[PDB]
Structure formats: structure tokens, C-alpha cells
RNA sequence: UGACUGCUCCCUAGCAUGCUACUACCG
RNA sequence: GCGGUAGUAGCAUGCUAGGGAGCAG
């Protein structure tokens, strides 16, 4: 309140009225002793009820503008994370076996369900039981999707390496059974 | 109603997004530019550009959400636990999720 | 009036998800929102159903004597029971099933 | 009574067994979840006190994990 | 209440206006005094309501604090507590099978698998000492989990097939006593 | 790891209205 | 003697936001 431009009048009117109490004041000067700090006090309160509103308004943009900054800084951290993805899932397209089906296409459009089926290098087979295993993945090589795949690893549900000799007809009760066979393309 | 009946004659690998190769600043992307519905037939997108330079925010949200790039960079999958058609395996391991008891 | 299955309201106070209701004093609002649902069981002709509501009003008081008595023997704090007694009286819950909506 | 005290001790027995990382052997966690889901659906206190021996024996066959002696001399069954 | 700095105004003016009717005076003096009582009374019923709100407010922040500190000691001690809960609850059930496999597995006779409920039901426990063998099993009969099994094979540490006739507080000090007894359920 | 909707109780901060006393100028 | 005007404190209502929790499909 030490810089409000209505402190001078209030201060002076207080001094004139209050400080001059000991001195004999007649009933005519008493009006000046009374109706001089009055009105001035009203105006000061008016000069303080507007300052309090300007302060709050001000401290509602120095908070709503930190939030406009925060979000743009964030908008630049996700815009650079999707970019770092769509350029890492691209360096992975064996562009000899992929430009060989987009080319044999009538216009260059192909179904998406035949891209991993004809242009992939690895196969993952998930097998529930032993009966399913001998009709799908018997031996070290097997044919699927008009191709030939050679087994490379057989992990299990626990993710521990199984060998192709632990898989018997009677040792089967001793394996975590969802078995995951990883195979590579041949030729 | 007729497409519903006639779509049971055709191979199940012909239904789904139709992808094509586009170029965004000299690099090949695979994106979806249509669809083949068992009911509504073949639908083709109206605003597809083959040669672009810069991707905005509204053009990265439509390329990350599409399954065209996630299922063209993952491994083939043959899942014998289910009888539903299976597309791809996005990683090298299969995730098994359980449910805990109460307190 | 609608009323629930008693085994659903009883079994919702016994089985939860830790820190939730494995200590009732840290959440007494869970049992005021479960005694609102159990209120119209007080009108049932079966007296084994009408007891599920009086069991919930007797536990909310137990959880309040403890709370205002656990912060007086470890920290010399004295809580005032003014405007807390409404949650173990059968008139805060009776007003949820009477017309002339409030709040 | 007695069928509700067995149904609450098998909820605390599969939480002790879930905090000991028995979830990392999916050939034994698949039996403990079947002996706990079966006790909760039981309708006799003679065929739920015998799946509580199989389920409890999983904890007493895990050696070092739980100090049985300390835990029984802790103002409990001696 | 008391002890508030603004309290020596609702005491002097309250005492004055008070005594003022016995001695008495003009209505002017009475009005003057009342227009000092109310002028320095608002100052009391304003500084003893703000405090009245701070005194209860304080006792709330210092209660959320008590909750954020008991709910972090209730979560950091989960393990130690549910094991105590389980054994407080296992004593109250007072079963016979449950109170056997617990006492047996405190002296040493723990199992090596799950206790099966079938009729073949092979079992494997580890008897650590002769007294535990003498109490539990006599002959070819074994009592465990309030059930009777028939011993089918006894095995010392490595693979030492002990015959039932040579384990008798005698030949017994000469072996590796952690045995692995195999049995099958009865009927 | 934790979807979309709807209802409802409790606590805190801000805005306007409604009967009063206090101020002060003005009638 | 009364009315209007501008601040200040105090008690309830409705609405708009944030936070925690409960139920239903």
C-alpha cells in the first residue's frame, strides 16, 4: 500500500485530525477533524479494492502461461518419439522381397495380411500340447505357407530353453506346455 | 445382406486394409489406402498422396494408429490355441497375464 | 424401492484392493456409500436382511471412535464430533429415497 | 462359521504364495489357482479342509522362504 | 476466546458502558461510548473467528498427515503381516490334518511336493532324524495329514536304498539321515 | 497392464443472489 | 424520524472447476 497514489491524502487527513486532538478543538473545526479523514478513507479503500483485483487477475496469467509452455514442450517430446519409431520400424523391410510383390501387383495395392506371410524372415509357432506338436513342427525342418522353415530355438512358457529331445511322448508331462518354436526361412 | 452371404465363398486373407507404398521425403512407407469389408465391399480413400515431404501432427497420429506398419514389420504367427485368424507377432516373446486374488 | 443382494453388499466390505479397506479409518467414505445401497433392506420382511444396514451403521461409528481416539493418544489432538453423527443415524440415508431432490 | 473361516484363510494363503514369486513357475501357480478357486466354491467343510492341505503344503515345501519356527513362536500355535 | 491481543477493548468498553448506567449521564455520552464499544468490538469478533477457523483447519492438515504416514507403514510391512495373519488364522481353525502337517513341518518333516488327494497319490517327505521316523511310521504304515500311506521306497542322501529292517536306533547312526521316503495313499 | 457412459455421497478454492450489524458521504 | 449509494465481516442456497471414493450395465 506504500505506492498507492491515494496514500498522501489519507496520511495528511489522519495527521490533521488525529494528531490535533490534544489541542483545543471547537465544534466547528471538529467537522474538519471528522469529515477530512472520512471520504479520503473511502477512496483509499476504493484504491485498495481495485489493486487487490488487479493483483489476482495478474496472478492468473502467470499460471495459465506456464501451462501453455509446459504443453508445447511436451508436444515436442511426443512429436519426436513417434518420428523415432516410424523410422526404426522402417529400417527393417528386406527391400528385395517386398519390392517383388508391390511390383507384381496390378496397381501396387496388396492386402496387408499377406505381407508378413510372404516377406518375413522369422516364424513363431505357439503349441499347446504334444499331439499338436507332431502334426505341425516335427523334426528340425517343416513346411508352412508354401515354404520351408528350419527350427532355431524352442523356449517354453517360463522362457527356458528346451531341446528337441526333451519333447517325448512321455516326458511331455514335465514341460511348461505353451511351447514357442522360432524358425528361420530356408533358401 | 447379399455381401454377407457371398463373402463366405472368398479367401479370408483378402478382407482387411489395402496397403500401398508411399514416399515421405525419399523413404518407402507402407500405409493403408482403402479397405475390403465382407459387407460393404471395396472402399478406396479419397485423399491419398504418394510423394510428401513433411508429416504434421495430424499426419503422424494417422500413421502410428494404422495396423499397416505394425503388421508389416513383425514376425509371422501361427497360434494353435485359438481358431481365429492370426496376423503377426509384434515381438519375440508371448506374454502370459494372470489375475491376482482379493484382499 | 430397489434393494440389492445382501451377499453383494456384505462381500464388498470383506474383499477389496489393499490400503483400501484393510484399514477402515483411512477410508470411511467407502462405508457411507455402501450403507446408502443397503438402506432399503431395513423394510424387508426377513430380519436377517434388515440387519445388514444396522451392521454398517455400527461399523461407521466404530471407525470414527477409533479415528478420533487414535489422534488423541499419539498426537495430543482433540477432534470435535459435531456434524459427524449424521452418518450413523438412519435419516441421512432415508432422504436418498424420498422425492424433492436435494444437491 | 467353519466354512467361512476356511474361505478366508485360502485368500491369505494365495497372497503369501504370490509374494514369494510362485508366479514364476507356471506349472505350480496353475495348481494353486485351481485349489483356491475350488475352495471358494465348496459347499461342505469336509471337502474344503482337504484342498487346504494340498494348498498349504506348497508353502511348507518352499524351504528357506518362510521361517516356520519364528512364525509359530510369535504368540501363535506352539 | 482470551489471550488474543485484541481483547483489552471488549473489556474496558464493556466495563465502562456497563457501569455507566448507575452513575448515569446525558444521552450524548451514552451514544459516544456505544460508538466506541461497537468500533472496538468488531475488532474482537473478527480476530476470534479467523482464529476459530485456523484452529480447526490446523487440526485437519495435521490429520491428512497422520493418514499419509500410517498408510505408508501399512504398505511397507505387507510381507511381515500377512504371514502373521495366516498363522493367527490357522491356529483358530483347530483342524486335525492342518495341525499335523504344521507340527510335522516344524520339527523337520516337510514334504517335497503337493499333497495329492487321489488313491495312488505318490508322496515324498524328508525325515531328518530317528525319533521323527519312530513316532510317525512303524512297519510299512505311515501316518501323515490324518491319512495312512504305505511306504514303497526309502532313500538316503544320494541313492542309498534303505531296507526297512536296517533303520533301528542302531544301524541308524551310520547313514545320512535326511531320508527321502516315498509312499502312496491308502483308502 | 487399468475402456466407454450414467448416477450419487464427502472435502477445498472462486463467482452472483438472499435477511442483518459496522463503517462513511449523501440526501 | 426514513430512503439510496460504496466498502467490510458473518450465516445458507444454486452453478461452474479440481481431488479422493461407491455402485450399475
Please describe what this structure looks like.
This is part of a larger assembly, with 2 copies of chain A (187 residues), 2 copies of chain B (103 residues) and 1 copy of chain D (78 residues). Chain A is α+β, with helices and mostly antiparallel strands. Helices cover 32% and strands 15% of the residues of chain A. In chain A, strands 2, 3, 4, 5 and 6 form a 5-stranded antiparallel β-sheet that branches. The termini of chain B are far apart. In chain B, the strands form 2 sheets. In chain B, strands 3-2-1-4 form a 4-stranded mixed β-sheet. Chain B has a two-stranded antiparallel sheet with strand order 5-6. Chain D is mostly helical and 78 residues long. Chain D has one domain. Chain D is built from 4 helices and no strands. Classes of the chains: A alpha+beta (187), B alpha+beta (103), D mainly alpha (78). At the A-B interface, strand 1, helix 6 and strand 2 of A face strand 1, strand 2, helix 2, helix 3 and strand 5 of B. Strand 1 (110-111) of chain A pairs antiparallel with strand 1 (16-24) of chain B, so a sheet runs across the interface. Chain C binds a RNA duplex (27 and 25 nucleotides) through residues 4, 12, 20, 27-34, 36-37, 87, 92, 96, 103. Chain D: This is Non-structural protein 7. Chain D: Residues 1-78 form the RdRp Nsp7 cofactor domain. Chain D: It is found in: Host cytoplasm, Host perinuclear region; Host cytoplasm; Host endoplasmic reticulum. Chain D: It comes from Severe acute respiratory syndrome coronavirus 2 (2019-nCoV).
Defining traits:
part of a larger assembly, 5 chains, A: 187 residues, alpha+beta, 5-stranded antiparallel beta sheet, 7 helices, 32% helix, 15% strand, rod-shaped, B: 103 residues, 4-stranded mixed beta sheet, two-stranded antiparallel sheet, 3 helices, 13% helix, 31% strand, extended, RNA-binding, Non-structural protein 7 (chain D)
How would you sum up this structure in a few lines?
It is classed as viral protein/rna. With 187 residues, chain A is of the alpha+beta class. Helix content of chain A is 32%, strand content 15%.
Could you outline the blueprint of secondary structure elements for this entry?
The structure is cut from a larger assembly and holds two copies of chain A (187 residues), two copies of chain B (103 residues) and one copy of chain D (78 residues).
Chain A: H1 7-19, H2 29-34, H3 40-49, H4 51-58, H5 66-78, E1 110-111, H6 115-118, E2 122-127, H7 130-134, E3 141-143, E4 148-155, E5 161-162, E6 179-185
Antiparallel strand pairs in A: 2-6, 3-4, 4-5, 4-6
Chain B: H1 2-6, E1 16-24, E2 28-37, E3 41-44, E4 51-52, H2 61-64, H3 67-70, E5 75-79, E6 88-89
Parallel strand pairs in B: 1-4
Antiparallel strand pairs in B: 1-2, 2-3, 5-6
Chain D: H1 3-16, H2 29-39, H3 51-60, H4 68-72
The structure holds a RNA duplex (27 and 25 nucleotides).
Subunit structure (chain B): Interacts with nsp7 and nsp8 to form the replication-transcription complex (RTC): nsp12, nsp7, two subunits of nsp8, and up to two subunits of nsp13. Interacts with nsp9.
Cofactor (chain B): Mg(2+)
Protein name (chain B): RNA-directed RNA polymerase nsp12
